[PDB]
């Protein structure tokens, strides 16, 4: 690939050099490797989380009594786990012959934590088997270790899918980069109140913005519009996971 | 481009290998070729199809009497055909010297069909000369042949532009990949009822989401914001095609 | 990168060759160079410009008396200048060792002008030090020179960040390409009236669509969701720049 020409930036004014951490340089290399290998598409969708939200908030006592704080991330992790098992191509990786998929029969999901040193993506194993408060607690531990540079490489390995949530900061949607060799990543932006047509009139519903990026070699456009659709359906009534 | 490191995925749990069809491998190669050659931009827009929809629905008898089902795709195809002739740079391809455009004086448009074996993009020739019921019928034939693997390569050649519609499944918008050597592709997602400001109050209008991806070497940002704008204008009053 | 196979396009109908201007070929080369070097992400956000708009419109007399027309672009330029100084990583470039950032202590911002010959991106120097009417006037001069091919390379050099506005034509959002070696670019699409929830009911607010694309090697997802958030906050009350 042609390089970018160097510019003497100091011809235009004062400059200062600050160096990158090795975490950032590792990070920079991997993103560029994914960017060039994965033909990326993003599928946007909004889920109605009005009821999910009222549930989250009523279980505040139970969570506090268990010592965990129940955020939106365990609810996202449970639902993507159920779906990664209904739609197995999302839980797979392209074999290096490029002529096969390796479908994983396990569901371990990573989630992005932004730390001062750079980006880390701890992994929760067998998300499909843990409960909302187990996932709430584990998520919080991995993120605290991650921030304290006390996370060990063992826990950054073998994920099947990544959730990257910026809802806690803002924005309307974004286009995340697939964390190759995985095949998809969910971005979650900020929920806001919205008018949704009910057949007769517009009702305020709390809408969550989802941005699924996928490896289009492996997932076609209709499989991914169906993944965001099923996820929107599950988050609108999480009891369907019971079925 | 650096390759992705292989991972022994079975260290993390049980895996299973399923092989890709040759259609998928062809598909995978072509997308990656476009991804690396085309600097991609997507321009989003929403068109007001409230009246187009009421027309579609009133011609249900005429269509049924003609044996066709009149969906949204013939109306999209007629309008993009008219526009591919008003704005000729969208109907052209970059010559291999990279120093010229080859403007096509014909309008043949392809449309994406997702089949079990993989993605196929049959082509309708001289879309600019056929009528809504001729396009309705032909679209349906090509898609049925496509699904039955009875489509022959002759009909997958020489398109000028691609429409990729996921409206029948869901989602809010996506960023399609340009089907090189063409220079643009329209993605169409699901229509939903929306409040649109009329000067005084918000009126529910049925809005169609459009996502135009284009080859920015050949099309600049203002030409493409003008293409989605004209298309939104045409779909809001398709009689302007008569003019 | 594999090339695209040539097609005899004339097998399908009449074709015509029109040649590209050297400006377009320069343009084509640079975009492709950025596309392949920068792992791109776009962060979308909407800012409430209801009050900014009413201010713009009341200073119409002052602007007319000064000979300038006060559009939205000087207000965008002042705010991005303030922010490029609050969040310095956005005002920096990756050193060619790839192991350091060069933080620029100056703020010069470029803005995209689409001319018949192709795209030009004149630069305003020390945007942080000029006023809304100085920026209004200079912006207009550079664009007129740009359209008249009377712009000299001196004024297309050493920008820190780019604004690309298509609001004057239309659309809902787009994904601009980073103008490497800069690290981010703001796309601005068309403002429209929207229902925004106020705690109790929906109020019509004039919303401006922002699309920030960034070089993810250098900027992480949370730094960019925070940039669009602060910008949305500043445009909603531009007096915060006084603070
Ligand atoms: C469990 C976790 C690892 C992740 O938690 P989380 O789901 O991000 O929630 P959080 O950090 O508490 O988020 C902050 C606030 O914004 C809210 N928020 C989260 N997602 C939101 C969304 N998508 N839309 C709107 N608001 C959101 C939270 O619920 C929380 O509200 P309160 O402070 O008023 O209770 C937590 O302990 C943590 O470290 N959080 C820091 C943020 C983070 O890194 N998240 C990574 C997710 S990928
Ligand atoms: C003519 C065609 C080739 C394409 O038809 P189409 O325009 O996609 O319509 P369809 O398949 O009938 O779509 C299914 C339903 O969702 C609707 N739908 C289509 N586009 C929609 C949109 N953009 N927004 C909301 N709903 C939509 C349809 O009108 C239809 O409604 P009913 O079943 O209630 O009449 C058809 O015979 C076919 O094979 N359809 C299968 C889907 C497909 O592959 N489409 C490819 C288009 S690219
Ligand atoms: C100062 C400038 C360089 C840029 O001006 P600008 O901010 O783009 O405004 P403009 O060209 O006057 O825009 C045309 C109209 O659409 C409006 N418009 C601009 N931004 C808009 C937005 N984001 N949303 C909605 N409408 C918008 C303008 O305010 C103006 O309204 P009136 O004509 O009714 O006053 C101007 O002299 C010029 O050359 N404009 C041509 C367009 C252009 O190239 N803009 C480049 C910006 S990057």
- Between CA C173 and CA C180, with CA C175 as vertex, the angle to 5 degrees is 140
Other CB atoms within 10 A of residue B168 CB: 13
Q: Residue B243 half-sphere exposure, CB side, CA atoms within 13 Å?
A: 10
> Rounded to an integer, what distance in angstroms lies between the CA atom of residue B213 and that of residue B216?
9
DSSP for chain A? -PPPPP--GGGSS-EEEEEPPHHHHHHHHHHHHHHHHS-EEEEEEEEE-HHHHHHHHHTHHHHHHTT----SHHHHHHHHHHHHHHSGGGGEEE-TTSSEEEEESS--EEE-EEETTEEE--EES-GGGS-HHHHHHHHHHHHHHHHTT---GGGGS--SEEEEE-TTT--SEE-PPP-TTSSEEEEE---EEEEEE-SSSEEEEEEEEEEEEEETTTS-HHHHHHHHHHHHHHHH-GGGGG-
DSSP, res C8: -
Contact list in A for residue B211 (CB cut-off 8 A) is none
User: How many CB atoms are closer than 10 A to CB A70?
Assistant: 21
Which two three-digit tokens encode residue B169? 């499944």
Residue B163 exposed, middle or buried by CB count within 10 Å (0-12, 13-18, 19+): buried
Contact between C91 and C84 (Cβ < 8 Å): yes
Per the structure block, which two tokens stand in for A129?
């088997």
Ligand 1 site, residue A185, Cβ cutoff 6 A: no
Distance CA C24, CA B89 (A): 13
- Which of B66, B166, B168 best tests ligand 2's pocket when mutated (most atoms within 8 Å of CB)? B168
**Sheet of strand B92-94, all strands in order from the earlier edge strand to the far edge:** B92-94, B100-104, C15-19
Residue A40, CA distances (Å) to B32, B116, B167, B176, B221 in order? 9, 21, 20, 9, 20
Q: Which of B171, B187, B213 to mutate to test the interface with A (most CBs of A within 10 A)?
A: B171
Q: List phi, psi (to 5°) of B221.
A: -60, -45
Other CB atoms within a 10 A radius of the CB of residue C220 amount to 21
State the pairing for strand pair A109-111/A113-115: unpaired
Angle at Cα B17 formed by Cα B16 and Cα B19, nearest 5°?
Answer: 150
Beta bridge partners of A188: A165, A210
The 3-state DSSP class for residue C192 equals strand
Instruction: Tally the C-alpha atoms within 13 A of residue C118's C-alpha that lie toward its C-beta.
Output: 16
Residue A204 CB partners (closer than 8 Å, separation 6+): A193, A194, A195, A196, C197, C202
Residue pair A23/A156 in contact (Cβ under 8 Å)? The answer is no
Q: Are C170 and B46 within 8 A, CB to CB?
A: no
Residue C239 tokens, joined: 């007096």
Specify the ligand 1 atom closest to the Cα of A111.
Answer: 48
d(CA C230, CA C216): 19
Of residues A77, A67, A184, the one with CA closest to residue A139: A77
Number of domains in chain C: 1
Question: Which residues pair with residue A208 across a beta bridge?
Answer: A47
The most distant pair of C-alpha atoms in chain C lies apart, rounded to whole Å, by: 66
Contact B84, B90 (CB under 8 A): yes
Closest C-alpha to B38, from B180, B205, B157, B206: B180
CB atoms within 10 A of CB B218: 22
Q: Burial code of A72-81, b = ≥16 C-beta within 10 A, e = fewer?
A: bbbbbbbbbb
Alpha-carbon gap, residue B212 to B187, rounded angstroms? 6
Q: Which atom of ligand 2 is nearest to the CA of B165?
A: 48
Pick from A145, A146, A148, A138: which is nearest to A109 by CA? Answer: A138
The separation between CA A1 and the C-alpha centre of its own chain, rounded to angstroms, equals 29
Quick one: tokens of B159?
């398109």
Alpha-carbon gap, residue A78 to A234, rounded angstroms = 10
R_g (Cα) of chain A, nearest Å = 20
C212: helix, coil or strand?
strand
Cα–Cα nearest to C191, from C91, C104, C73, C112: C73
Q: How big is the CA angle at B43 (ends B84 and C86), to the nearest 5 degrees?
A: 155
Task: Name residue, tokens 């470039």.
Answer: C93
Nearest residue to B215 (alpha-carbon basis) of B85, B121, B44, B92 = B92
CA distance C44 to C174: 9
CB contact under 8 A, C15 and B103: yes
User: How many Å apart are CA A215 and CA A94, to the nearest integer?
Assistant: 10
Encoded tokens for A35: 């960017």
Question: Do the chains contact at C35 and B33, CB–CB below 8 Å?
Answer: no
Closest CA to C105 of A5, A10, A6: A10
How far is it, in rounded angstroms, from Cα B112 to Cα C63? 51
For residue C157 the two structure tokens come to: 């050099």
Q: Which of B24, B172, B192 sits opposite A197 (nearest CB)?
A: B192
Q: In this structure, what token pair is assigned to residue C48? A: 């409430």
CATH number at residue B69: 3.30.559.10
Pairing of strands C15-19, B100-104: antiparallel
Residue carrying structure tokens 């980073």: C178
Which residues share a beta bridge with C17?
B102
Contacts by A139-142, CB closer than 8 A, 24 or more apart: A139/A71, A139/A73, A139/A74, A139/A77, A139/A111, A140/A68, A140/A69, A142/A113
Residue C164's domain comprises: 1-243
Q: How far is CA C93 from CA A227, B6, B18, in A?
A: 38, 32, 44
Beta strand extents in chain C (DSSP E only)? 15-19, 40-48, 92-94, 100-104, 109-111, 113-115, 118-120, 123-124, 161-165, 173-174, 184-188, 192-197, 202-215
SS3 C178: coil
* Cβ(A51)–Cβ(A236) below 8 Å: yes
Q: Distance between CA B45 and CA A113 in Å, rounded?
A: 33
Determine the angle formed by the axes of helices A50-58 and A221-236, rounding to 10 degrees.
50
Select from B71, B80, B144, B145 the residue to mutate for testing ligand 2; criterion: most ligand atoms less than 8 Å from CB: B71
How many whole angstroms separate alpha carbon C143 and alpha carbon C122?
7
The sign of the CA dihedral A86, A90, A94, A99 is: positive
Which residue from C minimizes the CA distance to B181?
C4
Nearest to C171 among B44, B100, B105 (CB): B44
Asked if B241 contacts B85 with a C-beta cutoff of 8 angstroms, the reply is: no
Spatial distance between the Cα atoms of A47 and A237, rounded to a whole number of angstroms: 10
Residue with tokens 């448009």: B109
Largest Cα span, chain A? 66
Tell me the C-alpha to C-alpha distance, in Å, between residue C6 and each of A27, B23, B42, C3: 37, 21, 25, 9
Please give the helix or strand (H or E) that residue B19 lies within, else none: strand B15-19
Which residues of B are designated catalytic? 216
Bridge partner list, B131 = none
Under 8 Å between Cβ of B2 and A35: no
Token pair for C165: 């506005």
Residue partners of C3: CB distance under 8 A and separation at least 6: B33, B37, B96
Catalytic annotation, pick one of A40, A108, A168, A216: A216
Q: Are B50 and B208 in contact (CB under 8 A)?
A: no
Q: CA A239, CA B18: separation in Å to the nearest integer?
A: 32
CB-neighbour burial class of residue C243 (10 A; exposed 0-12, middle 13-18, buried 19+): exposed
Biggest alpha carbon distance in chain B? 66
Instruction: List the one residue out of C182, C34, B32 whose CA is nearest residue A1.
Output: C34
Rounded distance, CA C145 to CA C191, Å? 27
* Ramachandran area for residue C114 (φ above 0: left; ψ -120 to 50: alpha; else beta): beta
Is residue B85 within 8 Å of residue B94, measured between CB atoms? no
Nearest to B177 by CA among A170, C83, A219, C114: A219
Residue with the nearest Cα to atom 47 of ligand 3? C165
Q: From atom 8 of ligand 3, which residue's Cα is the shortest distance away? A: C168
State the nearest Cα–Cα gap between A147 and chain B, in angstroms.
Answer: 25
User: Distance between CA A233 and CA A226 in Å, rounded?
Assistant: 10
Resolution, given in Å to one decimal, reads 2.6
H/E element holding B150?
A: none
Peptide bond into B116 cis (omega under 30): no
**Cα-atom radius of gyration of chain B, to the nearest Å?**
20
Contact between residue B186 and residue B227 where contact means Cβ atoms under 8 Å apart: no
In degrees and rounded to multiples of 5, residue B60 shows phi and psi of -60, -35
Neighbours of C39 (CB within 10 A): 21
- Inter-chain touch C39–A18, beta carbons under 8 Å: no
Enter the tokens of residue C208.
Answer: 């401006």
Could you tell me the CA-to-CA distances from C152 to B35, B139, C136, C155 in Å, in that order? Answer: 34, 52, 20, 6
Please give the C-alpha separations between residue C229 and each of A20, A84, C43, C44, C238, in angstroms, as whole numbers: 25, 32, 10, 10, 14
Give one word for B98, left, alpha or beta, with left for phi > 0 and alpha for psi -120 to 50: left
Residues whose CB falls within 8 Å of the CB of residue C146, separated by 6 or more in sequence, listed in order = C113, C115, C120, C122
Cβ neighbours of B15 in A, within 8 Å? 102-105
The two tokens of residue B121 are 């993009």
Contacts 24+ apart (CB under 8 A), A51-55: A51/A236, A51/A237, A52/A235, A52/A236, A52/A238, A53/A191, A53/A206, A55/A238
Is the omega angle on the peptide bond into residue B215 within 30 degrees of 0, that is, cis?
no
The backbone torsions φ and ψ at residue B141, rounded to the nearest 5 degrees and listed phi first, read -65, -55
Of the candidates B108, B195, B223, which has its C-beta nearest C195's C-beta? Answer: B195
Ligand 2 center from residue B169 Cα (angstroms)? 9
C231 half-sphere exposure, CB direction, 13 A CA radius: 34
């Amino acid at each position: 690939i042609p390089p970018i020409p160097p510019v003497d930036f100091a011809k235009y004014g004062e400059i200062e050099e600050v160096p990158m951490t090795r975490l950032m340089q590792i990070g920079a290399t991997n993103l560029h490797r994914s960017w060039l290998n994965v033909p990326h598409v993003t599928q946007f969708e909004s889920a109605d989380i009005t009821e999910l939200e009222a549930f989250r908030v009523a279980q505040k006592a139970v969570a506090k009594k268990a010592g965990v704080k129940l955020t939106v991330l365990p609810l996202l992790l449970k639902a993507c786990a159920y779906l990664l098992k209904e739609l197995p191509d999302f839980n797979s990786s392209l074999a290096p012959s490029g002529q096969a998929l390796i479908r994983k029969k396990y569901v371990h999901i990573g989630f992005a934590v932004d730390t001062p040193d750079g980006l880390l993506v701890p992994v929760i194993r067998n998300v499909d088997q843990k409960s909302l408060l187990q996932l709430a607690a584990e998520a919080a531990e991995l993120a605290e270790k991650a921030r304290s540079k006390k996370l060990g490489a063992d826990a950054m390995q073998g994920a099947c899918f990544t959730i990257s949530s910026l809802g806690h900061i803002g924005g309307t949607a974004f286009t995340p980069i697939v964390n190759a060799p995985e095949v998809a990543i969910l971005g979650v932006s900020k929920a806001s109140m919205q008018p949704v047509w009910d057949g007769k009139a517009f009702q305020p519903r709390l809408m969550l913005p989802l941005s699924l990026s996928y490896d289009h070699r492996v997932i076609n456009g209709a499989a991914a519009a169906r993944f965001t659709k099923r996820l929107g359906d599950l988050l609108a009534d999480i009891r369907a996971i019971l079925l």
